[PDB]
Design a protein around this ligand. Sequence first.
Ligand SMILES: CCCCCCCCCCCCCCCCC[C@@H](O)O[C@H](CO[C@H](O)CCCCCCCCCCCCCCC)COP(=O)(O)OCC[N+](C)(C)C
Ligand SMILES: CCCCCCCC/C=C\CCCCCCCC(=O)O[C@H](COC(=O)CCCCCCC/C=C/CCCCCCCC)COP(=O)(O)OCCN
Ligand code: SF4
Ligand code: SF4
Ligand code: SF4
Lengths: 210, 63, 156, 176, 303, 144, 53
Amino acid sequence: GVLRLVMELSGEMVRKCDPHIGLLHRGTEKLIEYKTYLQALPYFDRLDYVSMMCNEQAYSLAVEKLLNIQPPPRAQWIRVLFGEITRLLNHIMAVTTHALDIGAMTPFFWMFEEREKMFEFYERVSGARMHAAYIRPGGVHQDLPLGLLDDIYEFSKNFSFRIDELEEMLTNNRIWRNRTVDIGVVTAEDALNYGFSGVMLRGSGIQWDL
Amino acid sequence: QLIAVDEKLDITTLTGVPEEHIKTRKVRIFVPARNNMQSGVNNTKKWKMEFDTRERWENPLMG
Amino acid sequence: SRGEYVVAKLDDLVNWARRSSLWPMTFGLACCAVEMMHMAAPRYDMDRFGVVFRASPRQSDVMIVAGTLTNKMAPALRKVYDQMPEPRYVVSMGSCANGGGYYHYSYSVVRGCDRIVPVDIYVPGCPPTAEALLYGILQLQRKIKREKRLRIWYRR
Amino acid sequence: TYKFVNMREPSMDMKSVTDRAAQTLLWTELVRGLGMTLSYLFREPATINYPFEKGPLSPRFRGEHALRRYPSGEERCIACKLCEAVCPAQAITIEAEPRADGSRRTTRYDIDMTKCIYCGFCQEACPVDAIVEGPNFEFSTETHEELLYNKEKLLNNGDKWEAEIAANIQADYLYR
Amino acid sequence: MFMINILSLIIPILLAVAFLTLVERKVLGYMQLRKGPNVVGPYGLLQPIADALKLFTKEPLRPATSSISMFIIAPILALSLALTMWVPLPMPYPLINMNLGVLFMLAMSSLAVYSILWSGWASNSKYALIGALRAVAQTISYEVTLAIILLSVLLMNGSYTLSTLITTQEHIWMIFTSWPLAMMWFISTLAETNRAPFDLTAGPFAMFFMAEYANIIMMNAFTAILFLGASHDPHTPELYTINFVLKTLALTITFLWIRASYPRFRYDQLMHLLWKSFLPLTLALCMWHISLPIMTASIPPQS
Amino acid sequence: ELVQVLRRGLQQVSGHGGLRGYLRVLFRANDVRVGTLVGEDKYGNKYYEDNKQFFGRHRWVIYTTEMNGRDTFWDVDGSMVPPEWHRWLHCMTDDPPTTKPPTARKYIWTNHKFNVSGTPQQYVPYSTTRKKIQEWVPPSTPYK
Amino acid sequence: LVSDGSSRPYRCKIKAPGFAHLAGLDKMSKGHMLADVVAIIGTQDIVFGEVDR
Ligand SMILES: CCCCCCCCCCCCCCCCC[C@@H](O)O[C@H](CO[C@H](O)CCCCCCCCCCCCCCC)COP(=O)(O)OCC[N+](C)(C)C
Ligand SMILES: CCCCCCCC/C=C\CCCCCCCC(=O)O[C@H](COC(=O)CCCCCCC/C=C/CCCCCCCC)COP(=O)(O)OCCN
Ligand code: SF4
Ligand code: SF4
Ligand code: SF4
C-alpha cells in the first residue's frame, strides 16, 4: 500500500531502518464497538483485503465460540473450500506483486487472469467480487448456485499449468535467485521470539501450521 | 519507592479534551428510568453518565 | 468566419490529443487499488485505450485516489497533487475516497478527498468493479472532449 | 505430513558439473524463459472489447439501489426502518407519516451512495422486497452532490430497472 | 543535393522512433495476453501523434532555481549525438564515407554520457545527482567492454571501414565465426542504453526520450551490420537495404522481448557481472582472436 | 493454412456490407468480426452472438448512431443498453428478450435514458419533507 | 473478542501477522543493500489495512 520508511545508510548498506505506519489507520476497533456483531462483520473484509473470507471465518469462529453453537457440516465444507480459494488468491497476489517489484511484471498479468476467474466465483456465490461478506457466524449466508461446483472443477483442473508457467520464469532463473537467495535470513529462535507466524516461521524450518 | 503524596486526582491536562469542553459542560449521573412501554427492569440496573444537550440544526442540503 | 473555424479545428485536435493519451498516477491507499490493477489486467486492458500503467507523478495527467484518505496521509496527497503538471484531472474511486464510506464517522479519516483536492469524476462502489472504473475513465475522456479552451480565448 | 522445498544435494560427478557449467556459460534457463514468453505471445489474448462487450455477472450482483412497487403501482416500502437500523454505514435516513389515505408510507428515504458499502444487508432485511440493490454499475458522477439519492431518485431507478430487477429476483428468490 | 540526403536521413529516423513507442506497447501487450493501443487510429497508428501533440501542449516546469544553461544544453547534445551516429553506417552506401567509421561511432558513444552528467548536476537536487552518478558509472564501465569486443571483432575485418564488413561477410555471417563476442556485445548494448534488465533510472523530456530510442535503433542496426552481413549486389542496393532493415527490426523486437521477459538486476550485481564475468572472458577472447589469424594464416587484406 | 485465414478475412470484409461498412464497423467498434444477429433494439442497437468465441467475447452490441437527443456516432457508453438487453448482454441469462420478453408494467419506463451526469438533465438533491415549525403571523390591524 | 452480554461487542482487538512482520523488518534488513529492502518487504507479505486497522 502506502509506507513511510526512514533509514540511515552508510554507502549502499542499510545501517538502520524505521517504518512509520498509521497512514491507513481508520480506527476500526473503536468503530466496531458502536455496531452489532452482524454490523461489525463487514469490517473484517476490509482488514486484510487480499484474503477476505479468511477474516470472515476467523470472526465467525470467535463469535460462535462465545455463543456456544456450531455451523452445520455443509457450511463448514463451503467455508474451507472458499478459504482455500482465497488462499490461492492471496498467494497469487504475493508472488506476482513481489515479482513486479523486482521487475518481472509478466506473471502479474498471467496470474491476474486466474484471479479474475476466482473473482467471478466470488461474485457468483455472493454478488460481490471481493468484499463478499458471505461467511457469517451461523454459517454461509445464501448456499451455492447450481452450476458453481462444475465451474470450480473446470477452473481448478488447469491451474497447475498456470503455476507451472510461472515456475519456469522464476524458479530456475539466475536473476531471481540472485535477488532472493540469502536475503532476509531469520533464525528460528528469532522468528519465534519476534512473534512471526505463517510462512515466516515455516521458511526457517519450524514445523507449525494451525 | 513510594511518594505517599496527598492530593486529589486530576488528569485534565492529559486527556487532550479542548479547554472549552471541560469547564463548560455539565455531566449528569443517573439510573435510567424504565421505559413505560415495557414492563422489563433489566435496563435500570447500572448507572449512566451523559453530557448536556447542545444545538442541533438542519443541513441546507438534504435537510 | 474563418477565425472561429480555425480555433474550432485546433481545439478539437488538442482535445483529441489530450484525451487519447491519459497517463495516470494511482494513489493505491486501500483495497480499491486491487480493482485498479484488475482494470490493467489482460481482460480489461487499460493500456489499449492509451492509458499507461503506473506513470510517474511528474508526467502524469490524471490522479486516481483509490482508498481511504486518513488525516496522517492528506498532506502527502495534497503535496503530490501540487507537483503534477497542468492540465491535471482527479478521479475519485470508491466510497472511502468519495465521502468517507464505511469510516465516515472516524477521528482519523478525511470525510472525502474533495476536501483536499478538486475532483472531476466520482466512481461509486465498495469497490467499483474494474469495468465501472473503466466506464469512469471513458466518461472523463468524454468530459475532456467537451471542453473548449481556444473558443474561450477567442471570445475573451 | 510435511515437504522439503529446498533440501536437494547437487550431484558432484564430472558430467553433472559440466552440465551446470554449460547452463552457466550458455544461458540455457534464460533461453527457456525466452521460449516460454514467445509461446505466450502466440496465443489468443483474453481482452474483451468494452464497451461493446461486457463482463459476466450473476443475478446476485449488488449495484445501484432501487425502490420497487407492487404490480398495482403502490410502493412496497412501509417505513418499517429495518434497512436503516441494519445499515452498517448509517447511509439510510427515513422519515415517515400517515398518508392522505391513512397508509403507512415514507416522506423521506435518503441513501448516501458515498457512505454506502454495498453490502446488501438493506435488501435482505426488507420484509416486503421494497429496497433492492439493482444490477446497474455504470453510474459514475461528475459531482459529489448527485451521489446523494433521495426518494424520487430511487423511485425513478426502480421504475427504470423494474424489468431486470424482477427477472433477477425471480431467478434467485428460491435461494433466499 | 547533399542537404536533401541529410534531411532524407534525419527525418525518417525520427518517424521510425515515433512509431517505435507504439510497436513496443503493442508487442508488450500481446506478450502479456492483451493488446496495445487499437483505439487511437485504425490500429493505434495515430497514437504516437496523439502522444507527441499532448507532450508539446503540456506546460513545462522550469525549476526556477536551476542553471538554465546546462538545462537547455543537455537535450541538444543528446539529440545531436543520437542523430549524428547514423551517417557512418553503410546501407549499403554511407551518407558520409569515412575510413575510421567505427572509431568515430565509439567516440560519439563516449561523448554520450555528458548529457546524463549535466542533467544530473543541473537538476538542483541531491538524489538526482546520485542517480546520475550511478548511471554514468554503469555506462562507462560497460563501454569499456564494448570497445574491447569491437576491436576483437574488427580484427577479422582488416580495417575500421564500416563498408568492408559487407565484403568480409560475403559468404558467412560473423555470428558463426565468433558467437560469444556477439552475446556479450548484445548484453553490453542492453546495458549501454539503460534497457531492462538494467533500467535502474514535457519538451526536453520528449527530446531525451527521442534520443534514447534513436540510440537503441542505431545500436541494433550496428549489431546487424557487424554480425549479420547481408549480400550486396552493386546493381541493386534495394535488396541489401531490405535485408538490413529486416534484421534491424528483428533485433529491436528482441530488445522489447527481453524487456518483457526478465526481472531487473541489482546495482552491485550488474557491476559485479561486468567486472568479474565479462571482462576476463572478453580479454581471453581478445587474445584468442589476436592469435587466430596468425595461427590459421587468414589475415584480412586491407592495411 | 494461410490461404484459409486470408479467405476468412475476405469473408469478414464481405459480411459487413462491403468496404464502406467494413471501415464503418472498424472505426466504430475496433472490431470487424461477423456474428449471428440476435436482435434489434427500439433505440437502434444491434445485438450479435458467436458461440465459438471464448466466454466474454461471444456476445456483443453495436450501438446506435442517435439515441434520445445526442449524436452517438463516436460517443458511446455502456449505459445506452436497455435493461432487458442489459440482462442478456451481461450473461445474467441465456435467453434474449426476443424469445421471452420481460413482464409488462404500467409504471415501467417506456424510454430508457443513459447517464445524464454533466448535463442540464442531471439530478439535483433536495429535501423532500415539509417545514417542521410554523411561525406566528402578526396581525395586519394596528393596536392603537 | 470481549462481550459484556449485550448485542454489541465490548472490545474487539485484531491481531494481524503483518504487525509483527513489519516490526521485524528492522532486524531482517540489517547489513543488506538498499535494493534488498524491497525484496524483504515483498517476502513479508504486508498489507497495510491489517497492519494499521
Ligand atoms: C507535418 C505537420 C505537422 C504539424 C502538427 C500536426 C500534427 C500531425 C497532423 C495529424 C493530425 C491527426 C488528427 C486525426 C484525429 C482523428 C481521430 C478520429 O479517429 O477520432 C474520431 C474523430 O473525433 C473527432 O471528431 C476528430 C477531431 C480531430 C481533429 C480534426 C482535424 C484537425 C487537423 C488540423 C491540423 C492543422 C494544424 C495547424 C497547427 C500546426 C472520434 O474517435 P474518438 O471519440 O476519439 O474515440 C472513440 C472510440 N470508439 C470509436 C471506439 C467509441
Ligand atoms: C577451441 C576454440 C575455443 C574458442 C572459444 C570457445 C569457448 C567458449 C565457451 C564459453 C563462451 C560463452 C560465454 C559468453 C559469456 C558468458 C558470461 C557469463 O556466463 O555470464 C553469466 C551471466 O550472464 C547473464 O546472465 C546475462 C543475461 C542477462 C539478461 C539478458 C538476456 C540474455 C538472454 C537473451 C539471449 C541473448 C541472445 C544473444 C545473441 C545475439 C545475436 C546478435 C554469469 O552469471 P552467473 O551465473 O550469475 O555467475 C557469476 C556469479 N558467480
Ligand atoms: S472503498 Fe470499499 S472496497 Fe475500497 S477499500 Fe474502502 S471499503 Fe474496501
Ligand atoms: S448495501 Fe449495506 S451499507 Fe448500503 S444501504 Fe444497504 S445496508 Fe446500508
Ligand atoms: S425499504 Fe424495506 S426495510 Fe427499508 S423502511 Fe421500507 S419496507 Fe422497511
